[PDB]
Amino acid sequence: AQSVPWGISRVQAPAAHNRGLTGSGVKVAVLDTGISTHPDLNIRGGASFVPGEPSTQDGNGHGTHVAGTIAALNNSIGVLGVAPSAELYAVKVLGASGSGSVSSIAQGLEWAGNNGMHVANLSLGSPSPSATLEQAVNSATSRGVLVVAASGNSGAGSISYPARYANAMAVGATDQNNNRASFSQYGAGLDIVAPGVNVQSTYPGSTYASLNGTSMATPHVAGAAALVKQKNPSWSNVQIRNHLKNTATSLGSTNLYGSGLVNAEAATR
């Protein structure tokens, strides 16, 4: 039967669903290892930018898990996304190995701009700066994409790239007591946090799996953006971002948590 993962209830998505906000009409791209067809997902399309790996199917599992946290279907099986009616696009920019180049990722962001994505979720990164990668984020942002990226798993006091670039919204991970998970990177670049420990979601072969990471936190925010956008279709990527921050539940220092815990109920009220 369908379970509501605890992070879905923590971000208060069901209260948004009760006010008729499920993310319908919102285009969300998952820039990741691909998305496997799964009973509890609806994949509208996408593209691959990984040499040798032409399909948008997930040979790793990661992108499929991230996609379920955003948009796992509301039905009688598996789990439930923050935004179960969001239109999901699989943009493979990482190989099955789990790694991608500046160029794969940059072509994925260009794809998101050219196809009118409202949200791009990038649960991926590293400490490697790249001006070419920053330009691509800036370009997608100028074309209306809200770029949402994981703060990183190193535990350090600065955040990963691309999340660290100003026009990515950087997301850290919280635990079941609203504390920063110890791996979750923070710093001045951080915008907001979301659940990222024991996050059950969709997994290839019609399965489910419980992962920990800032990669799990990020889709909670990408989903909430989709809810805000459904409610306010004329809002820019910037207005959505500010509103998610303005309505977040403050948890302590902005350096450790940014605005605090994303709150889909307050964001859509």
Partner: protein
């Protein structure tokens, strides 16, 4: 004096922080270097060699280990840090280190953090040396702590991933500058 420089495939001296693919000197020996995960536990990713001579892998950024020298030319037989220009589901450092001199087992080159660094923590120090083969400018990679160890590739044709590590024959390489990047 201070050691001679390492050169890229275009004859220019290697510079700190510029991006270079690490290609096999002999294309018959395979492709450039990438990252490959566990089968079970994905992260940390290992450094591996693409078996396909046509695949360049990810470029690497090379920086002097220790105090910053003024010119920024990468020199032979001089400790340097090496990290991939790449982005991962692991969201961890892409800097290389070799398995600790103090650990049991084979030694591989891996990326990311370690639980239990060695006292000196020199496992992230590598050197580029001249290969007595090198009709033209071709190199071997080594890691030195209390001994020096040249790096080769654990080939497997399964094939599982071809892991870089303490094994001979050594992996002879060349550095190709990433095209305007």
């Amino acid at each position: 004096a201070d050691p001679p420089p390492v050169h890229d495939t275009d004859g220019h001296e290697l510079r700190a922080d510029a991006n270079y693919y690490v290609l096999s000197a002999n294309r018959a020996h395979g492709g450039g270097l990438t990252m490959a995960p566990g089968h079970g536990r994905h992260c940390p990713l290992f450094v591996s060699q693409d078996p396909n001579g046509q695949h360049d892998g990810f470029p690497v950024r090379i920086t002097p280990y220790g105090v910053a020298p003024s010119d920024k030319i990468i020199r032979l037989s001089t400790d340097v840090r090496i990290s991939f220009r790449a982005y991962t589901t692991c969201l961890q450092s892409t800097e290389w280190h070799i398995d600790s001199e103090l650990a049991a087992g084979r030694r591989h080159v891996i990326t990311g953090p370690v639980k239990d660094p060695s006292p000196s923590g020199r496992e992230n120090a590598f050197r580029i040396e001249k290969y007595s083969g090198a009709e033209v400018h071709e190199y071997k990679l080594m890691s030195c702590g209390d001994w020096c160890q040249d790096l080769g590739v654990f080939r497997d044709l399964k094939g599982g991933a071809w892991f870089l590590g303490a094994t001979e024959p050594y992996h002879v390489v060349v550095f190709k500058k990433a095209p305007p990047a």
